[PDB]
Amino acid sequence: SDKPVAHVVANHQVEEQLEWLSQRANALLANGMDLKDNQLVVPADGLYLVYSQVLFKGQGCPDYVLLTHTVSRFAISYQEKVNLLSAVKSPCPKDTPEGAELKPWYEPIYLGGVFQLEKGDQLSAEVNLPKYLDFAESGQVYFGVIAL
């Protein structure tokens, strides 16, 4: 009950964009964890389980798309952010499939691992094309950190 912990979820009112929120009944932001500029900030050096899930959805396949989901680590002294976890998905074929009344496709991605972080480190969980995010139902898009 003293361990820094966070489980933030996507703001469902901002379609086509990814904004993390703690103000939801089954979300958490406690024991030192801060959420600033859409990133989770760790309060102390230590081992942390970092995870995130996104759900993508699309109707038809007019475009061949490469979907990515990445959890990164950043500290002021860094040249740039570094990938901690990442995955890619390709829901559609190059050829635009024939026919109207398109059935939607759905693609989830889950990332998660243990990392030694330092006080003040900023963790981000982002997607390359947030226009395909699906957060119509709760529990589909989230980002968490838990001190071990």
User: Which residues 6+ apart lie within 8 Å of 72 measured at CB?
Assistant: 81, 82, 83, 84, 123, 124, 126
Interface residue with a second copy, options 18, 55, 125, 127 (CB under 8 A): 55
Q: Is 14 in the site for a second copy (CB under 8 A)?
A: no
> Amino acid letter at 101?
E
CB of 36: closest distance to a second copy in angstroms?
20
Displacement of CA 78 from its chain's centroid (Å) = 21
Interface residue with a second copy, options 13, 16, 23, 25 (CB under 8 A): 25
Q: Is 108 in the site for a second copy (CB under 8 A)?
A: yes
Q: Is 128 in the site for a second copy (CB under 8 A)?
A: no
Q: By CB neighbour count within 10 A (0-12 exposed, 13-18 middle, 19+ buried), where does 60 fall?
A: middle
Give the Cβ contact number of residue 68 at 10 Å.
14
Q: Is 132 in the site for a second copy (CB under 8 A)?
A: no
Nearest Cα to Cα of residue 145 among 80, 72, 66, 64:
72
Interface residue with a second copy, options 14, 15, 17, 113 (CB under 8 A): 113
CB of 17: closest distance to a second copy in angstroms?
20
User: Which residues 6+ apart lie within 8 Å of 97 measured at CB?
Assistant: 60, 61
Q: Is 118 in the site for a second copy (CB under 8 A)?
A: no
Site residues (vs a second copy, CB under 8 A) = 1, 3, 5, 7, 25-26, 28, 46-47, 49, 51, 53, 55, 57, 61, 64, 66, 70-71, 73, 82-90, 93-97, 101-116, 134, 137-140, 142, 144, 146, 148
